[PDB]
């Protein structure tokens, strides 16, 4: 019973202590519904934390660390109970234990604490977790331990309110440059995910990632055999190309677009959608980057997904098409016209997602505005496929912006 366990764990006889701590650990690690609240209420947390101090009994440290790991794997309130009982400085102490298993379990427990959120993370960082954590990365580290270390690095990179301190990013990035060459799938997926959490953190973090020289090693992972690596890489480099034209161009200079045929045709619709999101962030750049997309023979695939894809991919393809018109030259838009973009583009005008309707109308407006002489021909194409009837109907749309733009388009181009 919990009462007896707590009593025996407070004991000064460490054989009885160990048996009781192991019984608590068993309650916490037998299934996926451990009674964390009951064990917290019983008052065991201070006892487990005290057990963490027993350098003379590594078994007790390990078992207590395991129990605390599992308590900390629960809700924010339960993780915080672990933090409130002063567990963190003692885990940091155990990071320098001579016994590997004590060290590993302390790393795991800290991973759960760090994962709870940015304020916990920043407490742990302020006490100096990063350098000891990274110090375990060496040729002899067991692969299971290294997987835990890399997951902890994910947790150090991922929260955004606020993001991790710049110093911490500067310490972590060289380790990620080391780990991106590992062939263990788990380590590689977690490495690329940590990178993606850095590249989603802002232009300055993106530039830190670029300056580290790692992007040339990241881009080829878009064609890794493991789809989990492929999608993690798609996220990391996609976040990069959400930034400036120059950062996007760093990505394009690693032959990124070469990897996309196998992603636009992937059987998984979610992958098509994510690839088309990436490409829409490319077509929103300057004329050279639009041309990069064109020269890679990707537009017909984008237009096919716009026509026949699932609605999420269709939405992302509508974005890619419309974004092309921001800085695209008349000849680039003309290429799109040649590729039968208008019928499926216009077919998207009757969907329920007002954002898609707006995107399509903005694109059509820019296309017509750009075409000086061909405006009449493009209008004839829009009418041919039923697009004009759809715009006319949109004049009665609920959304202010949509019906205003429908009026604008009709008046400026279909009122001769």
């Amino acid at each position: 019973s919990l009462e007896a366990i707590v009593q025996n764990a407070s004991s000064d006889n460490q054989g009885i202590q160990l048996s009781a701590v192991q019984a608590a650990r068993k309650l916490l690690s037998s299934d996926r519904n451990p009674p964390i609240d009951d064990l917290i209420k019983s008052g065991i947390l201070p006892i487990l934390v005290h057990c963490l101090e027993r350098d003379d009994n590594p078994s007790l440290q390990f078992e207590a660390a395991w129990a605390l790991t599992n308590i900390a794997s629960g809700t924010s309130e339960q993780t915080q109970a672990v933090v409130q009982s002063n567990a963190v400085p003692l885990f940091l102490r155990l990071l320098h234990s001579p016994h590997q298993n004590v060290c590993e379990q302390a790393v795991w427990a800290l991973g759960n604490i760090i994962g709870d959120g940015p304020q916990c993370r920043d407490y742990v960082i302020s006490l100096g977790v990063v350098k000891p954590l990274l110090s375990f990365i060496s040729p002899s580290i067991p692969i299971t331990f290294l997987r835990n270390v890399t997951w902890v690095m994910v947790n150090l990179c991922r929260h955004k309110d606020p993001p991790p301190p710049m110093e911490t990013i500067q310490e972590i990035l060289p380790a990620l440059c080391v780990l991106i060459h590992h062939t263990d799938v788990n380590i590689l997926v977690d490495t690329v995910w940590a990178l993606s959490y850095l590249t989603d953190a802002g232009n300055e973090q993106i530039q830190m990632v670029i300056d580290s020289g790692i992007v040339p090693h990241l881009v080829p992972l878009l064609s890794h055999q493991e789809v989990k690596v492929q999608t993690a890489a798609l996220r990391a480099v996609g976040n990069i190309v959400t930034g400036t034209d120059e950062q996007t161009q760093v990505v394009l200079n690693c032959d990124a677009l070469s990897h996309f045929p196998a992603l636009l045709t992937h059987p998984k619709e979610k992958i098509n959608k994510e690839a088309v999101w990436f490409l829409s962030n490319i077509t929103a750049g300057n004329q050279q980057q639009v041309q990069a997309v064109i020269d890679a023979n990707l537009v017909p695939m984008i237009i096919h997904l716009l026509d026949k894809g699932d609605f999420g991919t269709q939405k992302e393809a509508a974005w890619a098409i419309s974004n092309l018109t921001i800085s695209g030259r008349k000849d680039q838009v003309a290429y799109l016209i040649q590729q039968n973009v208008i019928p499926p583009f216009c077919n998207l005008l009757t969907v329920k997602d007002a954002q898609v309707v707006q995107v399509v109308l903005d694109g059509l407006s820019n296309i017509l505005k750009m075409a000086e002489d061909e405006a009449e021909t493009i209008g004839n194409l829009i009418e041919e496929c039923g697009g004009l009837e759809k715009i006319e109907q949109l004049q009665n749309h609920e959304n202010e912006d949509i019906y205003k733009l429908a009026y604008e388009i009709i008046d400026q181009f279909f009122s001769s």
Binding site: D31, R158, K228, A232, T242, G243, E274, G285, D362
Partner: peptide, 26 residues
């Protein structure tokens, strides 16, 4: 409005867990 966009909801839903329990026999 047209332009670049950040990761959209529902994309990359298979993120690494924030927390992991150590389960005996798993």
């Amino acid at each position: 409005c047209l332009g670049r966009r950040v990761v959209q909801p529902g994309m990359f839903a298979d993120y690494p867990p924030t927390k992991k329990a150590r389960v005996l026999l798993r």
